[PDB]
Amino acid sequence: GLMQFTLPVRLCKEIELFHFDIGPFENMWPGIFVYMVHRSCGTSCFELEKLCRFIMSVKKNYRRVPYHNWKHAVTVAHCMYAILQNNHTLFTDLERKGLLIACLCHDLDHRGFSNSYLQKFDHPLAALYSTSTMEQHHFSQTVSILQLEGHNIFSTLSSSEYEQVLEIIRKAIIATDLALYFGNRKQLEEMYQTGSLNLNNQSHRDRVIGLMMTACDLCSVTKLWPVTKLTANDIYAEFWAEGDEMKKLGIQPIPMMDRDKKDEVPQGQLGFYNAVAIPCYTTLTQILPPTEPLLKACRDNLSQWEKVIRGEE
């Protein structure tokens, strides 16, 4: 109970910053996450014995894929931890509990393939879940791990607190379906400009939390340039693997996914930062001013990709 986690000084300090990289030492990532839960939620809110067993079962059910892996889970959790700490009073004790857990579990058992690829392959998961295929599977896996003996970190919540937090986690994980992001941000944009945004409206919170999940999920675009550049390699390793599999099914893949069209990556990133990342963090900064560092960082990286095209690296 009096068992704080501490981090080495540089981590202790840098972990509060949005642009923090969790490092190449796998074995520290659980302590990092526990540290985040304790400082964000309390040393009280989860029985340590149970959290650790949950964290290690979640690690076990991420696969050894280049991008959608255990490292991504904790990177995404970290970003949500930074947002919650810089917007202390805007969130309930329960939202803080469920959101860090939602981020850790949001890509559980990802196989390194898009919802589209499942649909054209005709994967059983596409039979069982027609939209947000991987995302409904990710939530399904979360509930599975929560139902293993000695794994229910939510044991101490009232029945109604319990349905609230599992409903936050479910909406949170579904929101990470980037197909849903576009409309969800358009509505938040419209609601913020016309000033009808109201954080006591539950349907309004849901949208705001959805955008936070999109923000946290893309936070590799908000790191120092060298982290962003090297993460971009990982994401393209999966994209091209998927393109190979599309060709294997007799389907010309979109260029993003074609390893022959590697030349066109820097323009691809421009499109992405402009169509997705920049608008995402803009609307998020508008709703939550303290998140501006994510927007500043995203812009630097957009500018870094512009330098790539102009042959300046």
Ligand X SMILES: O=C(Nc1cnccc1C(=O)N1CCCC1)c1nc(C2CC2)ccc1Nc1cncnc1
Q: Can 137 be counted among the known catalytic residues?
A: no
Nearest CA to 229 among 293, 301, 294, 298?
Answer: 301
Sequence-distant (≥ 6) Cβ neighbours of residue 44 within 8 angstroms: none
Q: Which is nearer to Mg ion, 176 or 285 (CB)?
A: 176
From 111-119, 149-157, 215-223, 269-277, give the range in contact with Zn ion by CB under 5 A.
215-223
- Nearest-approach distance from CB 99 to ligand X, in angstroms: 19
Site string for Mg ion, 87-126 (x = CB under 5 A): --------------------x-------------------
Quick check: 177 binds Zn ion (CB under 5 A)? Answer: no
Asked if residues 303 and 309 have their Cβ atoms less than 8 Å apart, the reply is: no
State the DSSP H helix or E strand holding residue 12, giving kind and residue range, or none if neither: helix 9-14
Residue 106 known to bind ligand: yes
- Nearest-approach distance from CB 17 to ligand X, in angstroms: 17
Chain positions 107 to 136 lying near Zn ion, rule: CB under 5 A, are 107
Residue 38 known to bind ligand: no
Catalytic residue among 19, 38, 68, 137: 68
Distance linking the first and last C-alpha atoms of the chain: 51
Residue 187 known to bind ligand: no
Quick check: 217 binds Zn ion (CB under 5 A)? Answer: yes
Q: Which is nearer to ligand X, 133 or 231 (CB)?
A: 231
Report the alpha-carbon distance of residue 136 to residue 226 in Å, rounded.
Answer: 33
Quick check: 238 binds Mg ion (CB under 5 A)? Answer: no
Report the alpha-carbon distance of residue 206 to residue 67 in Å, rounded.
Answer: 27
Provide DSSP, 206-222. HHHHHHHHHHHHTGGGG
Residue 177 known to bind ligand: no
- Is the Cα torsion angle 303, 113, 29, 213 positive or negative in sign? positive
Applying CB under 5 A, what is the total number of residues that bind Zn ion? 2
- Nearest-approach distance from CB 26 to ligand X, in angstroms: 19
Provide the H-helix boundaries in 110-252.
115-121, 124-128, 133-146, 159-175, 178-193, 202-217, 225-248
Q: Which residues are documented as binding site for 3',5'-cyclic AMP?
A: 68, 269
Residues known to be catalytic: 68
